Amino acid sequence: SHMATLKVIGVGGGGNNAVNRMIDHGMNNVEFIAINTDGQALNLSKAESKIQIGEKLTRGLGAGANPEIGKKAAEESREQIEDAIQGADMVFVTSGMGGGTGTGAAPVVAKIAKEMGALTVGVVTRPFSFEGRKRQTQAAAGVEAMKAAVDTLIVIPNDRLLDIVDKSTPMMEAFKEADNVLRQGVQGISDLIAVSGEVNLDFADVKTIMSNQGSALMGIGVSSGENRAVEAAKKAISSPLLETSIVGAQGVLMNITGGESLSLFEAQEAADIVQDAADEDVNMIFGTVINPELQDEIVVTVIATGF
Ligand SMILES: Nc1nc2c(ncn2[C@@H]2O[C@H](COP(=O)(O)OP(=O)(O)CP(=O)(O)O)[C@@H](O)[C@H]2O)c(=O)[nH]1
Numbered sequence: 001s002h003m004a005t006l007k008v009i010g011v012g013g014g015g016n017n018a019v020n021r022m023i024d025h026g027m028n029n030v031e032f033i034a035i036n037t038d039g040q041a042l043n044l045s046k047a048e049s050k051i052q053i054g055e056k057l058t059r060g061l062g063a064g065a066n067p068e069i070g071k072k073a074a075e076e077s078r079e080q081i082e083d084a085i086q087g088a089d090m091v092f093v094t095s096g097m098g099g100g101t102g103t104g105a106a107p108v109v110a111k112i113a114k115e116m117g118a119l120t121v122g123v124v125t126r127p128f129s130f131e132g133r134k135r136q137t138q139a140a141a142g143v144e145a146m147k148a149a150v151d152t153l154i155v156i157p158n159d160r161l162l163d164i165v166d167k168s169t170p171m172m173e174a175f176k177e178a179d180n181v182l183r184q185g186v187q188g189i190s191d192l193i194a195v196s197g198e199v200n201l202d203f204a205d206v207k208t209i210m211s212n213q214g215s216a217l218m219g220i221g222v223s224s225g226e227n228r229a230v231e232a233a234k235k236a237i238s239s240p241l242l243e244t245s246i247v248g249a250q251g252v253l254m255n256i257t258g259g260e261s262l263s264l265f266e267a268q269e270a271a272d273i274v275q276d277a278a279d280e281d282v283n284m285i286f287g288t289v290i291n292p293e294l295q296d297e298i299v300v301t302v303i304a305t306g307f
């Protein structure tokens with residue numbers, strides 16, 4: 001019997017913000033690591049494992065939008081980062097691109113994780129357009145470096161947050177919606193790893209769908225009542241915040257969880273929704289979990305790659 005260790009690593013300010021909010025929300029059987037140049041922010045981290053990088057370079061401050069300093073800071077702390085990762089089967093690196101620490105250190109952290117043997121997923125943001133063209137260009141270089149370092153990459157352009165708020169939505173509430181991409185994906189994978197299914201998927205199947213793939217989508221949908229399977233599948237692949245939509249996916253892992261009422265017909269319905277939206281012949285890895293505690297609820301988990 002295999003017991004997969006999942007870790008979430010926040011790098012720089014936004015990444016550590018996400019880690020803090022995820023710890024506050026409550027996650028279990030996931031270990032958190034906080035990496036930053038910024039010593040004051042690290043003192044505020046709720047993560048059990050904290051790594052201050054680059055103290056000789058920044059004297060405990062952030063990198064001040066210099067990504068070469070973020071990169072050197074991470075490289076010079078490689079052994080400490082290795083030691084914190086060692087044992088992970090899967091690592092999610094989350095970071096905001098555009099500054100110095102995230103842009104520069106997050107790709108180094110991802111490279112170290114993949115070298116340490118972890119299946120490595122990046123979930124990163126691109127800056128708001130109001131932050132200007134130079135920030136966007138610097139962020140794009142970070143995204144390209146992340147993509148070269150990870151197994152799979154999910155990019156959230158922060159401009160998409162402007163599509164889901166009204167004029168009064170608090171900034172912190174918008175940021176929590178972006179956090180959910182990472183948090184729900186980690187949770188869905190954790191649940192898949194842990195909970196035996198009637199058509200069982202496990203961590204090896206996650207490795208197959210994600211290893212050395214590039215862009216990815218991770219989504220969960222929940223619905224009930226009539227058309228629940230179709231509605232849950234549509235929610236799983238809906239991507240108001242994602243740079244990489246479902247369109248073009250050539251590989252999909254889809255797990256359906258439901259109660260004893262889960263029908264063969266509705267499972268096919270859900271699978272067809274996903275394949276129709278991808279508009280490709282999708283290589284599906286299909287799973288099913290019967291949770292009898294569920295009554296009318298259905299949960300569809302999707303990981304899509306092969307773009
Ligand atoms: N969605 C989201 N975006 C964030 C958040 N914090 C920062 N951002 C975005 O990430 C980008 C990088 O900010 P930050 O993570 O603080 O950068 P850093 O590299 O640690 C700062 P320095 O350059 O001084 O080292 C910001 O420009 C912004 O677009 C957050 O909590 N949520």
Ligand SMILES: [Mg+2]
Pocket residue numbers: 062063064065099
């Ligand atoms: Mg700064």
